[PDB]
């Protein structure tokens, strides 16, 4: 019965994030000489050009990590990350200007990505 003012007594169990959404594992490598850290909610296909991965597998997706956290890639680092599906209307605007509409337009996203030199198209 020691009193910590304002303390939590959390219930039992765990919280599953992004429940019921398709998950996808891909390998991603930082081909640059500076660190890249990627947040939980950036459309994954629109990340830094020098990250090499199968760009098509980033479309309509983001990292499957707790809201507000980030995956870090040191210079030269290659590792696997798990992605989850974007929700809501599954539309993306701005960021790197690769989508600007439905994430279903894969060919259009990939063509813009290729022209601008975002690594790993094909």
Partner 1 sequence: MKINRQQYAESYGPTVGDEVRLADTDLWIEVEKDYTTYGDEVNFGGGKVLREGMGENGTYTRTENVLDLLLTNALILDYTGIYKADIGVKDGYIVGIGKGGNPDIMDGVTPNMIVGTATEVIAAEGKIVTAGGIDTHVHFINPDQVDVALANGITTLFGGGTGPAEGSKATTVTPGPWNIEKMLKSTEGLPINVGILGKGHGSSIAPIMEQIDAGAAGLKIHEDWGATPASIDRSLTVADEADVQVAIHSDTLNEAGFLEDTLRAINGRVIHSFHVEGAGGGHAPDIMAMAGHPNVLPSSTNPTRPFTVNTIDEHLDMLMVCHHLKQNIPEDVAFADSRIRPETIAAEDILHDLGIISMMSTDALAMGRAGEMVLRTWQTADKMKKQRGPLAEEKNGSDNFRLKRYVSKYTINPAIAQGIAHEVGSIEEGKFADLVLWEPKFFGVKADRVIKGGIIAYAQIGDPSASIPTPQPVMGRRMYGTVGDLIHDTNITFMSKSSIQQGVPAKLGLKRRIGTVKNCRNIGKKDMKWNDVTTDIDINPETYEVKVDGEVLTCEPVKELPMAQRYFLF
Partner 2 sequence: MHLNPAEKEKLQIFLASELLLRRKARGLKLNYPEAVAIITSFIMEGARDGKTVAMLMEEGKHVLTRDDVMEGVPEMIDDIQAEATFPDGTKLVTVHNPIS
Interface positions with partner 2 (CB under 8 A): 2-5, 7
If contact means CB under 5 to 8 A according to the sort of partner, which of partner 2, partner 1, none does residue 79 touch? Answer: none
* Edge-first strand listing for the sheet containing 78-85: 51-52, 23-30, 78-85, 61-63
Cβ 3 to partner 2, closest distance in Å?
Answer: 5
Q: Would you say 2 or 93 has its CB closer to partner 2?
A: 2
- DSSP annotation of 76 reads T
CA end-to-end distance (rounded Å), the chain: 62
Q: Is 32 in the site for partner 1 (CB under 8 A)?
A: yes
Site for partner 1 in 35-54 (CB under 8 A): 35-43, 46-50
Phi and psi angles of residue 45, each rounded to the nearest 5 degrees, phi first: -65, -15
């Amino acid at each position: 019965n020691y009193i910590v003012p304002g303390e939590y007594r959390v219930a039992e169990g765990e919280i599953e994030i992004n429940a019921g959404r398709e998950k996808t594992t891909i390998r991603v490598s930082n081909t640059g000489d500076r660190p890249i850290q990627v947040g939980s909610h950036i459309h994954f296909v629109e990340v830094n050009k020098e990250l090499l991965f199968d760009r098509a597998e980033g479309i309509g997706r983001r990292l499957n990590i707790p809201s507000g956290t980030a995956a870090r890639f040191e210079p030269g680092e290659e590792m696997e990350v798990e992605l989850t599906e974007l929700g809501g209307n599954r539309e993306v605007f701005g960021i790197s200007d690769l989508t600007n509409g439905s994430v279903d337009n894969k060919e259009l996203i990939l063509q813009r990505a290729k022209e601008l030199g975002y690594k790993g198209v094909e």
